[PDB]
Design a binder for this molecule. Structure first.
Ligand SMILES: *CCn1cc(CCCCCCCCCCCC)nn1
Ligand SMILES: [Zn+2]
Lengths: 8, 276
């Protein structure tokens, strides 16, 4: 669905 | 197959002077810009992390821009570490610099676009949040709106204008995943500087390298351990130098024989920045 996202 | 003789900074230097060390990848974080004035990490934030989350920002952008006006540095001077990476570029050793930072200090230090993976974007350009408009605005327009304390709005949509930073909850640029697929099959050395490897998917980058590839951490604290193996009996390739990044890069440059080069580079480039 989307590219990997910025996560803490 | 341990390519390092000793698990020390000097061992990393000796390995870098050998013919096996041709392609070096740098993974850098906020720690390499703290000595430049860039900081590391009322409005009723539901949680303090929402200041950098895209959903909250789209709902309530005022806290972020207030913080931006508060923490906007008066000057942008790259540090000794940035110029160490610049020396790596000038000597044909730098395959890529993956940065978590948004201060563009790698560009100002002289790293070109092909050298860089700005994994979390940049503050330099900004865009309208409407995907059917995407009107682009420069850092001058953004800085004027930030210091006049007027929320940036698009001249075509009247929508919110956001700096091209990857907020928490946004996807990383496609260039990240394009470079990663090729860069880590060939990497001879990982230089991890100024990051505690706390933000994904950036941190996972340290596990993409081959198992024989040495990895040196220059950071105020050990990080990336399960994975980083510094202090076990099976340790064979991971070195940790704890302290300020500028000090670690000074020491590594001197051990490599580049002390005077790095000194001259820093002096001349800082003079050129103060001149303009
Ligand atoms: C998941 C992607 N991501 C982004 C970040 C960094 C979050 C902090 C952003 C700081 C903004 C500073 C505004 C002022 C800048 C002046 C040049 N981590 N992970
Ligand atoms: Zn627009």
């Amino acid at each position: 669905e989307a590219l990997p996202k910025a996560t803490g | 197959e341990r390519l390092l003789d000793e698990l020390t900074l000097e061992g990393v230097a000796r390995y870098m002077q050998s013919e096996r060390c041709r392609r070096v990848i740098c993974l850098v974080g906020a720690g390499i810009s703290t000595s430049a004035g860039i900081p590391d990490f009322k409005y009723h934030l539901p949680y303090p992390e929402a200041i950098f989350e895209i959903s909250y920002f789209k709902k309530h952008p005022e806290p972020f821009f207030a913080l931006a006006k508060e923490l906007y540095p008066g000057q942008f001077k790259p540090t000794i570490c940035h110029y160490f990476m610049r020396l790596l570029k000038d000597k044909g050793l730098l395959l890529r610099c993956y940065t978590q930072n948004i201060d563009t200090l790698e560009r100002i230090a002289g790293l070109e676009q092909e050298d860089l993976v700005e994994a979390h974007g940049t503050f330099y350009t900004s865009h309208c949040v409407s995907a059917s408009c995407r009107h682009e605005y420069p850092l001058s327009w953004m800085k004027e709106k930030i210091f006049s304390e007027v929320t940036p709005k698009c001249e075509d949509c009247q929508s919110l204008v956001k700096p091209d930073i990857v907020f928490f909850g946004e996807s990383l640029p496609a260039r990240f995943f394009s470079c990663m697929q090729s860069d880590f099959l060939k990497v001879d050395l990982l230089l991890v500087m100024g990051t505690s490897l706390q933000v994904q998917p950036f941190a996972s980058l340290i596990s993409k390298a081959p198992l024989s590839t040495p990895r040196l951490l220059i950071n105020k604290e050990k990080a990336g351990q399960s994975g980083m193996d510094f202090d076990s009996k099976k340790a064979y390739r991971d070195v940790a130098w704890l302290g300020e990044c500028d000090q670690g890069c000074l020491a590594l440059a001197e051990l490599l024989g580049w002390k005077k080069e790095l000194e001259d580079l820093v002096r001349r480039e800082h003079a050129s920045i103060d001149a303009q």
